[PDB]
Design an enzyme around this catalytic site. Sequence first.
Site, PDB file in Angstrom:
ATOM      1  N   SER A  49      27.879  37.329  40.694  1.00 47.73           N
ATOM      2  CA  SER A  49      27.403  38.898  40.079  1.00 47.73           C
ATOM      3  C   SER A  49      26.477  39.695  40.902  1.00 47.73           C
ATOM      4  CB  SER A  49      26.504  38.244  38.841  1.00 47.73           C
ATOM      5  OG  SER A  49      27.423  37.792  37.582  1.00 47.73           O
ATOM      6  N   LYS A  52      27.653  43.422  41.181  1.00 40.94           N
ATOM      7  CA  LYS A  52      27.292  44.263  40.387  1.00 40.94           C
ATOM      8  C   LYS A  52      26.464  45.338  41.097  1.00 40.94           C
ATOM      9  CE  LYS A  52      27.865  42.060  35.825  1.00 40.94           C
ATOM     10  NZ  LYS A  52      28.312  40.497  36.185  1.00 40.94           N
ATOM     11  N   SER A 298      23.288  41.272  33.265  1.00 38.63           N
ATOM     12  CA  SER A 298      24.606  40.779  34.192  1.00 38.63           C
ATOM     13  C   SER A 298      25.933  41.065  33.123  1.00 38.63           C
ATOM     14  CB  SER A 298      24.526  39.601  34.879  1.00 38.63           C
ATOM     15  OG  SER A 298      25.348  39.577  35.974  1.00 38.63           O
TER      16      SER A 298
END
Length: 466
Positions: A49, A52, A298
């Site tokens: 993640s 991102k 997230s």
Amino acid sequence: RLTELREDIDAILEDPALEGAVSGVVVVDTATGEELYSRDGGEQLLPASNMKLFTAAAALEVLGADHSFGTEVAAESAPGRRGEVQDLYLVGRGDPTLSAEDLDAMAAEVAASGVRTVRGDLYADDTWFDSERLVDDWWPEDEPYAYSAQISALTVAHGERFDTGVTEVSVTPAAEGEPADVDLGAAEGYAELDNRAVTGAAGSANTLVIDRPVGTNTIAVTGSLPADAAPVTALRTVDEPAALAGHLFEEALESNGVTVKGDVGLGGVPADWQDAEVLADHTSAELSEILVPFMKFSNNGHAEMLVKSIGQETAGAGTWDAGLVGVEEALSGLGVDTAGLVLNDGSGLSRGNLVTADTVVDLLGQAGSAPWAQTWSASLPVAGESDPFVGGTLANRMRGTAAEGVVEAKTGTMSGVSALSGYVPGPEGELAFSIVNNGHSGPAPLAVQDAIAVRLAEYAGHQAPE
Ligand SMILES: *C(=O)[C@H]([C@@H](C)O)[C@H]1CC(SCCNC=N)=C(C(=O)O)N1
Ligand SMILES: [Mg+2]
Ligand SMILES: [Mg+2]
């Protein structure tokens, strides 16, 4: 002082939780560009993640902090004296925060515009993006779960976190030996139900399972819920989020006095429609505000939707191919060296993604001096902050340490991959760091990540709140 830090990080990185793992760790003073610490900085690693970070910065570059997203309702012409229309289209243009309540408000507008009867069919139009619902290398076993929701231009977002393309399943025990009661939430009347679950004796073991079997639109429930158990809720994905949105919109129309005579399906506004009558619309909040629930928690759906929105803005193509090139070009235009980057999605769920810790820190520096630096910064989890919209995925980490209230960083964990990268503001200068671990075989080394961020907070002159 600087030599102590290197020794202390060196020792943190000897932890047995990192046995056989590769770990990219880079720390830079951002006031001077001084490299405080660097190990395997140029090594290519899965970011999970942390991907991102790249996606959010590009979205802010391409779309702008003020960008908002539209949804509208269209008929071939306005309603008559009789207040009739034939077919109706709900058109989604990539809003990742569109609620059931926004549907009700558009339904009220349709009524207010003079429509009483939809004589034809209701179509859900998500053609603003392509119909590629999942990334190629995403794992089919993940599909039932919110973080693997299908991607569409038209999707209903659940709750204040705006989880898209899901329904909330609630299972309640009955008397012992009676089936458990299953409530499909928004997908009632949309998804099929296969309820095989029973209510067990008071004090029995909870073995309840909620699945959506691969390539179906069926919620399959098995196992046993104790008579004395609290009800169980779970977010589960549906097939075709746009058609769920169509379903909910039909209900909202009916609930605002508008009778739908025909069927509900997918379809795009016909090309032969001359001057479509817009009977209702909705405008999302601006991207700066959307960045909060996206980055604090997230949100994978938000990330992929922003990639496709990037593809739409740069190329008129709501596509991963186009969106991912757009992300890469935005990052280059920002002064980020993208040589070490392999982009296969926006959320980081894909195992085809690659970053380097050096590339991460590079981005952290460039984003820190961008016009939108504050909007970007405000979206990141803040170490140890108990308000979930403030602490995000860091809410219950690093409490009662020097990092609490000070470190702002993005997290990321999947099997064999974990990451923590962000800023440590000091009396002296803002530090940027990236910690990316691949290949550890136990739990994600979160304690290791915490120790480093805490050490950096201390080095920057911070002390634990007591
Ligand atoms: C990013 O690493 C994953 C993404 C691939 O699905 C998500 C899931 C998690 S971890 C569990 C969710 N909250 C944590 N309690 C994160 C994360 O950054 O923590 N992102
Ligand atoms: Mg229904
Ligand atoms: Mg402090």
